[PDB]
Design a protein around this ligand. Sequence first.
Ligand code: HN3
Ligand code: NAG
Ligand code: ZN
Length: 1016
Amino acid sequence: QCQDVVQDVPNVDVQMLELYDRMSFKDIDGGVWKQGWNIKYDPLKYNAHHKLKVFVVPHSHNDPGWIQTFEEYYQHDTKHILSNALRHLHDNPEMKFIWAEISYFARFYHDLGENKKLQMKSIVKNGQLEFVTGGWVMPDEANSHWRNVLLQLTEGQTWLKQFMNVTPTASWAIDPFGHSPTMPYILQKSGFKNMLIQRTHYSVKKELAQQRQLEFLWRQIWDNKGDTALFTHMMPFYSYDIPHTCGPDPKVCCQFDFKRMGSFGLSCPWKVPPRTISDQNVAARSDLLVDQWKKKAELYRTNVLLIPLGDDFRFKQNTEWDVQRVNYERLFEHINSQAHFNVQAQFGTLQEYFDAVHQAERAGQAEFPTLSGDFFTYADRSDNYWSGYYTSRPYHKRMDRVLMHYVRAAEMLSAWHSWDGMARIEERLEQARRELSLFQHHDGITGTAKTHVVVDYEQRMQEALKACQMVMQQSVYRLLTKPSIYSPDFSFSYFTLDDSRWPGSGVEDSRTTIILGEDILPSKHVVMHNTLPHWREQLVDFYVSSPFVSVTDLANNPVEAQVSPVWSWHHDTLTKTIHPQGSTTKYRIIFKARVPPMGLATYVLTISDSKPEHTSYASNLLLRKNPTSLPLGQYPEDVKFGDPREISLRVGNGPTLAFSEQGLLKSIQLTQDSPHVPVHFKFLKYGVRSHGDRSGAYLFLPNGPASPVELGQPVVLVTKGKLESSVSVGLPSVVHQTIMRGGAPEIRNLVDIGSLDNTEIVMRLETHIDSGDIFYTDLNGLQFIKRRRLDKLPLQANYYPIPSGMFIEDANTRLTLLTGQPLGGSSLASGELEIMQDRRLASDDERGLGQGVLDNKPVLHIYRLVLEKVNNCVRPSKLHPAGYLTSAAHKASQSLLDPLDKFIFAENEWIGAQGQFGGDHPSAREDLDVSVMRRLTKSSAKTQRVGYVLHRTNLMQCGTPEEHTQKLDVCHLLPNVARCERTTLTFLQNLEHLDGMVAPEVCPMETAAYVSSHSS
Ligand SMILES: Cc1ccc(C(=O)C[C@H]2CC[C@@H](O)[C@@H]3[C@H](O)[C@H](O)CN23)cc1
Ligand SMILES: *[C@@H]1O[C@H](CO)[C@@H](O)[C@H](O)[C@H]1NC(C)=O
Ligand SMILES: [Zn+2]
């Protein structure tokens, strides 16, 4: 049935980890092809019976924000490009053009009059204008979560099906900075047949070109059978621009970019301009161009050649359309009529190229190699590795993950009902999906846009978060109010969200205090949502105006609670210390919420005059020389003080953690009897080189290994409670916090790099674990891939994306660090993990951004730290390129990415309140998630349709008996099911009509989509 993703090592022609181990990475001058060699070809290879078929594919790379905002580029460039494309393609039936970014196309098309809409539909229908990929954007592939890659693909493709009646099956990704196998994974499950990539390490291009392995069947690293395979074309040269797409010599190719003759303010840096094609020069020009084509053709296996023709924001001016088209038409007429060339050249689209390639394949003309692995970390030249952008603008990287979850929760909570148009549910959800989708752009989440553009993305995401809150809170009120009492004002706020970790303590004072008092309001209802499809317990906290508060469920059962102070950290510019102040006007109440699968649970907070029976109070200990009193308004326990010292803590039956006198972890003891395993946190700093290339938004070019941050004598705060304990320390640039709730600790860093120019702050873990040169990092929150540290490569080359987690292990022990935000990281020595927190860079790194990174702001990074014994786990063999999380580590990741949502009832009394929603929902096996639940129809549809994306991960078998859980059949989650279909992941095509309207669960590492149809 299901493929074994652990025990069978796939046999592939190219495995990128193995390739990396063998390659030398020498950066030698290859001649005109600076990073290759002088290509030779046999002129007699092509003849009358075997011609070279050449497809010249016009394109225009349009960034949805970079140096300008989306709207600035739309007004100044893109609207003119699309307008002139429509005119010129309409008027010139053999001209072709491909388009990738649907965010721009939708913006344009909706502003068109009906006549022009019809013209546009016609040039798409007839194949002149072809959409490639069809996502809202061309996303980053390093930092993006797979769920958001799917979100943005679906946004663009849903628009294309509705308005243009097409669904692309070829993908075009010419600009992301390195490439991820998460893309073919999603694309192949979304009906795609082909994909194209460009930005891969120059040494990889050379190696694959030499073996004619630039076209390959890209399968997942664990895929033994090959069912995930997607045909992939890797472009061979340094850029997608015209000088680097006609052939190996940019000095020649530049002469065939007809926009470079002077009137457009562009020129050829190789000092030879293009010249207008005429009858007197066409033979000579053709000879030069065809020679380039035949050289490029040597790197591939068929007699069909792809020649992209484009660059950034090209095909704007009418004069540009003419100058490219007329000159190429003259070259085609000459070349195609001269038999001695044995070439047939034409304008084409991307699908046309792929179709012809596979025709050649089926004719037995070529067979293609299989490949697995990824294409990180990218270098475009010399030692310029693009690992900086794994961390750049970390505030917005963390915001990405927050909004990811709010979109999921808003779509899910509102999916349970059909909503009247007046509720504006669909409107708000579309806005939220679109702003988050926009941010997936390869200058959005990457932190590689100009300062004002970053601000635009932030403002858009803030509006998206507000839209999610509105939808979520309307949905909670409807789900938990007696139906005959339910009386909505769709503009009113029945609940406000409370979020403990975004923007976070010390980032924004954004949270509302629950105000109670005998003379004002004795009690308050709160509600938790659990977006995951299994019963879940999690500690939750709220701010309250009194420490004397107790918690009940809606059956009035007491719930054990803990009250702690509200601590905030301050750089005391008077004492020159970083130390905590306690609130005298508000307090934190903490309790364990238990919430049904995909459901809601209601609790009540009630004030009393004195300590309630079921509420305890944390002790607080401030460790510093030279202490002063710390009064806490009404809080019942006095703060204690002491000189700095080592401390040890244990919550519940959980691990025992020991800390240095500087408030940093030193060891973890898993059980009563077990060893105190050395696990040490350390903060260090990287600098920038004083001569040669400087680090910037893209590039990480350290001036050597990191140096320890000088800690001085930092102030340490220890809070000890029955339910939650913590150690917090004010370090230079970081308030570092270790929180213990009875399992793996949570780590929070409040990172404020301040005015520390040319500094990158790293958090490192030092252990004994005999990992050697092996570590594991994830790809897009989807899969874990084996990394091998290579000392033959510079430090920055050994940095990889940490989009959600990383681990090291030996035969017996593993340490896993899970993240709530994508950052860059590595293991630079056996037993180490490290992850960059922020970076402030004074210089530009010469990739067109034209600024450093000097717009840092405070950010709250979050993590879980999981130390485990793994000697009993069934792990992949030493040759397997994948790794897998344990149950504890997977749950720890879910706690960061999809926590419980918290809602505080806004008015004094909630008439008709109910205690629970979803008590009858199936509690699915722990490795299964309902990644997406989305109602697909508006209220006026006779047949309602609801879409589900189901993802099953793969967890290691380590000897824990599995408990019987319930089968999850998403098609029966809503009543009156009439049909259940398996669909592509975008929901746009039906793949299978399902027996008995039952949606089967998926295999480990598989993702499936289902749509249920409901007659009532
Ligand atoms: C002198 C110079 C050299 C290289 C470049 C790029 O690669 C720019 C590429 C890659 C980075 C990315 O931020 C940008 C935008 O997305 C543009 O589309 C071009 N991209 C630019 C200038
Ligand atoms: C859309 O394209 C399909 C498939 O080519 C065609 O049959 C149909 O007439 C077009 N219009 C629709 C489905 O409205
Ligand atoms: Zn770009």
